[PDB]
Design an enzyme around this catalytic site. Structure first.
Site: not given
Ligand SMILES: CC(C)C[C@H](NC(=O)CNP(=O)(O)CNC(=O)OCc1ccccc1)C(=O)O
Ligand SMILES: [Kr]
Ligand SMILES: [Zn+2]
Ligand SMILES: [Ca+2]
Ligand SMILES: [Ca+2]
Ligand SMILES: [Ca+2]
Ligand SMILES: [Ca+2]
Ligand SMILES: [Kr]
Length: 316
Positions: A142-143, A146, A157, A166, A226, A231
């Protein structure tokens, strides 16, 4: 670092033993030279300054508890690289073998993982909501997906484009999990979420509503939390992707499944040839239809099934 390619052994977050590609120069580093321009794993040492230090080990054996998140981030980045190269003829996230960097032990009790624009970052979890998140192959993939998205469609985003972003990460995270073929499913994060609760996960693609997420456009979230529900509303697209692959009848609409491999081909082509930073759900449907047309023909079952799946989730 400059050195010679070596093969270490260690244990991941779930206790499984695996070999890892390392580099020797005084220490053994988590630097895999066998893939592209390398896969590099770093220790963030419970802090938030990135990347931290390239992971160094004295003996090439990675069986300490502290090692386990690094072993898995490193190894599962390799699996994900292999999936994109072998399945889609894509060389790393930029298509030109960019070095892949990950940091583990990010912050303290950190219940998340992310791509920061330049690298992957994994928390250890607080031990109740999560164990270290690199233990989930679907999470790792997943990561890294991105990064693929950011170099290709560039989906903003937030709001619908962000929910597509997502869903693309959940779809390919799942397809990588199936590629590795160890306990594969259509759930997200089950291997690292809630160690005290069995049978749950962070999201379900087959039944998003099980974990509160919409499975039809008429149930989309349109508030501001969010990033406008990225998500949450991903469940609508995740459900469509699940139906394309596996089939089913959903809100009375029947979908003939075409299998995971064709799902992956259609969505990879949509991501890399048709989607744009501002694509919305209706535009994703059009991109998927066109991609399936390019691959299989306008009269094909694959095109018909893409249309049925988007119909089933209320996206025209
Ligand atoms: C409880 C949580 C694990 C659930 C969810 N996360 C995921 O499903 C996976 N991580 P991800 O989707 O990659 C984060 N996504 C994230 O942190 O987006 C912000 C960002 C933008 C630009 C630079 C740095 C960070 C969330 O964040 O609500
Ligand atoms: Kr994830
Ligand atoms: Zn993500
Ligand atoms: Ca060691
Ligand atoms: Ca699984
Ligand atoms: Ca999974
Ligand atoms: Ca659990
Ligand atoms: Kr990749």
């Amino acid at each position: 670092i400059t050195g010679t390619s070596t093969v270490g052994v260690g244990r991941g977050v779930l206790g499984d033993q695996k070999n890892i590609n390392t580099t020797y120069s005084t220490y053994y580093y988590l630097q895999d030279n066998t893939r592209g321009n390398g896969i590099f794993t770093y220790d963030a040492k419970y802090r938030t300054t990135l990347p931290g230090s390239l992971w160094a080990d004295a003996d090439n054996q990675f069986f300490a508890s502290y090692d386990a998140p690094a072993v898995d981030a490193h190894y599962y980045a390799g699996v994900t690289y292999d999936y994109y190269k072998n399945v889609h003829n894509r060389l790393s996230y930029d298509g030109n073998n960019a070095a892949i960097r990950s940091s583990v032990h990010y912050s303290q009790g950190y219940n998340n993982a992310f791509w920061n624009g330049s690298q992957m970052v994994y928390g250890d979890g607080d031990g109740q909501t999560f164990i270290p998140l690199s233990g989930g192959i679907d999470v790792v993939a997943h990561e890294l997906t991105h990064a693929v998205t950011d170099y290709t469609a560039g989906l903003i985003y937030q709001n619908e484009s962000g929910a597509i972003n997502e869903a693309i990460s959940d779809i390919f995270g799942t397809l990588v999990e199936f590629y590795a073929n160890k306990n594969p499913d259509w759930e997200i994060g089950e291997d690292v979420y809630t160690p005290g609760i069995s049978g749950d996960s962070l999201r379900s693609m087959s039944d998003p509503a099980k974990y509160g997420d919409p499975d039809h456009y008429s149930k989309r979230y349109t508030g501001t939390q969010d990033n406008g529900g990225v998500h949450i509303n991903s469940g609508i697209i995740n459900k469509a992707a699940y139906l394309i692959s596996q089939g089913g009848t959903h809100y009375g609409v029947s979908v003939v499944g075409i299998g995971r491999d064709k799902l992956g081909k259609i969505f990879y082509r949509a991501l890399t040839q048709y989607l744009t930073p501002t694509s919305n759900f209706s535009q994703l449907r059009a991109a998927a239809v066109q991609s399936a047309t390019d691959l299989y023909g306008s009269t094909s079952q694959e095109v018909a099934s893409v249309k049925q799946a988007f119909d089933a989730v209320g996206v025209k």
